[PDB]
Design an enzyme around this catalytic site. Structure first.
Site, PDB file in Angstrom:
ATOM      1  N   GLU B 292      25.733   4.242  38.064  1.00  0.00           N
ATOM      2  CA  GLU B 292      27.171   4.263  37.854  1.00  0.00           C
ATOM      3  C   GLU B 292      27.807   3.621  39.081  1.00  0.00           C
ATOM      4  O   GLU B 292      27.640   4.080  40.203  1.00  0.00           O
ATOM      5  CB  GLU B 292      27.687   5.688  37.629  1.00  0.00           C
ATOM      6  N   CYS B 326      36.134   5.659  40.933  1.00  0.00           N
ATOM      7  CA  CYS B 326      35.659   4.476  40.251  1.00  0.00           C
ATOM      8  C   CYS B 326      36.530   4.250  39.029  1.00  0.00           C
ATOM      9  O   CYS B 326      36.584   3.155  38.482  1.00  0.00           O
ATOM     10  CB  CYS B 326      34.188   4.670  39.844  1.00  0.00           C
ATOM     11  SG  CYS B 326      33.085   5.270  41.165  1.00  0.00           S
TER      12      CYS B 326
END
Lengths: 541, 541
Positions: B292, B326
């Site tokens: 990720e 993010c």
């Protein structure tokens, strides 16, 4: 709110008997004769354009290598790049098409393969890859039909795996295909696998460049044509035979590669993996590599085993389709106390085994191996089996490439459990046997586990339930498909999802419900139905 | 004949309010004071042995970088290799342990985090990582608790996904952990992620080397300790802080690496991926990489949008936790017709935003960013926002590292939709704004999609349902988490499985039911209950 969802229930394709007078035996015979003396010209297919290049290639019948069964050609870089571009331009629409509509195409292909096209797809696999009736049946029909139906079921049911919704928000998962194109690279030894390697990703909303195996070209193209007639739009799957290295170089060089669905040798898989890694910076996303490779599979025999089951099971696993299965048994571990009985029975039945032309003589157990490179490698092993001190050929050992790539079923005893022949994948009808002291069966279980680099298939033959439980624990990671009192080959879709780890691949279990997850990149959408509120929080006031 | 399947019925952990008067606000205040002036010595943990090396390191409070909140140390190669070895020696037993027993450990940890340990885990996250009350709550409590509970549910339910049985054979799937050890590498910005990166694979029968982020060490160790007390046996998760490159070099050099569970920067992810590829030959199996990475996320505004929702949603997404997510919105696309209103509102609310010490002043919206390197990078961007012709700072633009790594929320307008600031991930409280002609909103949708390398999060603000449907289609691959009239941050477990593709990672969707499939290598066992029969087939006779 609400929504009408959908579900799909499927059954495995029945495996027909092909007995004297049975319609399928007759249809098949007719399809085989319709192929005699005929050579199909097979073009590359990009969209709907059939394309010929100057790099022409031939597929020959393994048992009669003088007969050219197909003429085809290798795509060049230029053609492969045009196929990527055309595929990409078709992808958004195809990805946007509802799963139900896409599944429908594979269900129609399945039915076609089931009835009208069955004899044909069988005949082409028998003639092109050298399969006996029954090997072609369980492969080009049953396994391929099941792939199509079951993956369809899996993908339809997958759409119903939706997240929790909590007011004022509704959440939903959208199963996007991967963004880019998938490269599908299929092996010679199962027509079913080519269909699944290209088909499953296509099903999931992907566009595919399919490089079929040269030595299975006749039947793979038949699969392709059947998908197209079943309704697969142009540029979803590009039929592009090609040189292996060139194909890999081209696809791993495209910024648009988003996956490789590969079945074949580990070195080739590793090579593709390393190329993708080398080029990581150029891809728009991280490409997904799926790799099913070979094995060095075992039949482990405990003294309690039904000897007859050991014999027939091992003969089948080791020598069916000439042992050209990643699941084929190639190492047999027998307790000393059972060896004389098993050795005799094996030698007796071994002498009853007919090797010949599977189209002309249905009494053939298995036929020639696939091609010269393979025949050559197998001779090197038969010669190793004569040359090595630790090794003694007990049966067979001969081969003859004058008509086909014929190899006798060979049975070799090793006095050394770690002999190279006990460890290296031959992909030929070559069974190695290690005889172990009954009192040392636990250490021998450990040897089964520790001896090779592979973890594909394996079987335990034992009537003692406690030994079964114990071997099951010990061999946990020696086989991804583990068989108890059954042969190590013949996985059935939805019943034994297939694959294994260690050096045997990434174990994505084609044939199971999870396999298709590799080919979707889920998007989660949250819709909030009320205005948001102050950016601040109460605790802050 | 019988199938027995277990379900687990679980709810998302309630997010608490912490308003004056509430018990949680009081417990939290107490836990924060219990931390004032104190510095925990945090050892590496291999098995049950606490180990100190000479490579000592400190974790400081982001908003008060003079205060060292923890002393810890980096594992050396020698210690990392002992941790691999000890972990491997514990793996078979742990993998064999029934999923229910393993899940139980994470359910007890969950309950501990829910009640008695809540204030503590919040306080350590606030103090160590610079989180406000509510950011610590949704993270170190809610998201982490949910991970543990929901992954436990998903793993328990996974065991009931079993293949079809057909007499005389029974088939079963065994969900093996991966053979080897998994390397878990967690980032600073969520305590929950460290728990999930190490925890989910452990849940699935894996053993883990956990390298926690230096700048989250205090809270991560608290997570570790809680797992241990909840019943996690020794050597299942090794707590091994370390230099990043050294850790990666060591784990990618072990023949026993079977996975890397990584959340962090894409370059680091790609680097690990390239190392694993370089070393492919030495691994016993193909290691699974889960990554990720970051995003350059958008809020796209259509002229029909609820302006207030746009304002509060964007303020929250862009600036909460100083934009160090993010998922944080960093590019805002506003139609010309709405700009004056949205610009005024934004500037007004921007001026109401308090940036300070989150432990001392609960009125703080967000506090200092995580560390100096990040602070430095952010100043380079603020300076870029003054130096660039296409750019105009509309609000904020100042920063001060004299006490903490404090940065003002900054709002920048770009006249160039392709300006580097519209494309590059800053990980700071820096919102870029592009104003587009209403008549050209379709082209602008395309720009949103085409501008960056990322596909993590994104939101559309629109009251017009037809524009929503349209943006949803156009932005299909621009965001793995897509929000309609809500902010682009704040995924909740089981409601919005999190992750995206393009350069944003491998999209394994932690928070959903499929995530755990990456951490299992299924074995399928077929037991046949009747003797086999002749190796020959009827059709052959």
């Amino acid at each position: 709110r609400w929504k009408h969802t959908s579900s799909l229930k499927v059954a495995n394709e029945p495996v027909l008997a092909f007995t004297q007078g049975s319609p399928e035996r007759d249809a098949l015979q007719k399809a085989l004769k319709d192929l005699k003396g005929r050579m199909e010209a097979i073009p590359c297919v990009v969209g709907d354009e059939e394309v010929w290049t100057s790099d022409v290639q031939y597929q020959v019948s393994p048992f009669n290598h003088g007969h050219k069964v197909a003429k085809f050609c290798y795509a060049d870089k230029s053609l492969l790049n045009k196929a990527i571009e055309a595929a990409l331009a078709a992808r958004k629409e195809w990805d946007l098409k509802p799963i139900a509509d896409r599944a429908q195409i594979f269900l129609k292909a399945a039915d076609m393969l089931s009835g009208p096209r069955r004899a044909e797809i069988l005949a082409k696999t028998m003639v092109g890859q050298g399969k006996t009736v029954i090997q072609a049946e369980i492969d080009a029909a049953a396994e391929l039909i099941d792939f199509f139906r079951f993956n369809a079921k899996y993908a339809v049911e997958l759409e119903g795996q939706q997240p929790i919704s909590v007011p004022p928000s509704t959440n939903s998962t959208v199963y996007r295909g991967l963004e880019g194109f998938v490269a599908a690279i299929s092996p010679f030894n199962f027509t079913a696998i080519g269909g699944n390697l290209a088909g499953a990703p296509a099903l999931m909303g992907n566009v595919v460049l399919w490089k079929p195996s040269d030595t299975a070209m006749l039947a793979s193209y038949a699969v392709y044509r059947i998908l197209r007639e079943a309704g697969l739009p142009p540029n979803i799957i590009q039929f592009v035979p090609a040189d292996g290295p060139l194909f890999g170089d081209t696809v791993t060089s495209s910024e648009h590669l988003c996956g490789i669905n590969f079945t074949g040798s580990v070195p080739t898989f590793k090579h593709l993996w390393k190329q993708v890694a080398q080029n990581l910076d150029r891809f728009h996303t991280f490409p997904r590599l799926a790799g099913e490779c070979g094995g060095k599979n075992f039949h482990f025999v405990h003294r309690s085993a039904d000897v007859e089951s050991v014999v027939s099971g091992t003969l089948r696993s080791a020598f069916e389709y000439g042992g050209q299965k990643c699941s084929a048994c190639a190492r047999l571990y027998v307790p000393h106390s059972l060896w004389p009985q098993i050795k005799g029975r094996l030698l007796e039945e071994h002498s009853r085994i007919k090797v010949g032309d599977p189209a002309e003589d249905f009494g053939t157990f298995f036929s020639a191996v696939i091609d010269a490179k393979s025949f050559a490698r197998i001779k090197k092993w038969l010669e190793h089996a004569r040359s090595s001190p630790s090794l003694t050929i007990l049966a067979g050992g001969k081969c003859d490439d004058s008509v086909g790539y014929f190899v006798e079923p060979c049975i070799v005893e090793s006095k050394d459990p770690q002999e190279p022949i006990m460890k290296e994948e031959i992909f030929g009808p070559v069974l190695s046997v290690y005889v172990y002291p009954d009192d040392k069966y636990k250490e021998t279980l450990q040897l089964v586990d520790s001896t090779t680099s592979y973890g594909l298939t394996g079987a335990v033959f034992s009537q003692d339930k406690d030994v079964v439980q114990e071997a099951t624990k010990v061999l946990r990671n020696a086989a991804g498909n583990f068989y108890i009192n059954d042969k190590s080959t013949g996985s059935i879709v939805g019943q034994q999802p297939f694959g294994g780890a260690r050096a045997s691949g990434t174990n994505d279990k084609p044939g199971g419900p999870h396999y298709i997850l590799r080919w979707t990149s889920p998007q989660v959408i949250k819709e909030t139905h009320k205005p948001l509120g102050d950016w601040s929080y109460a605790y802050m006031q």
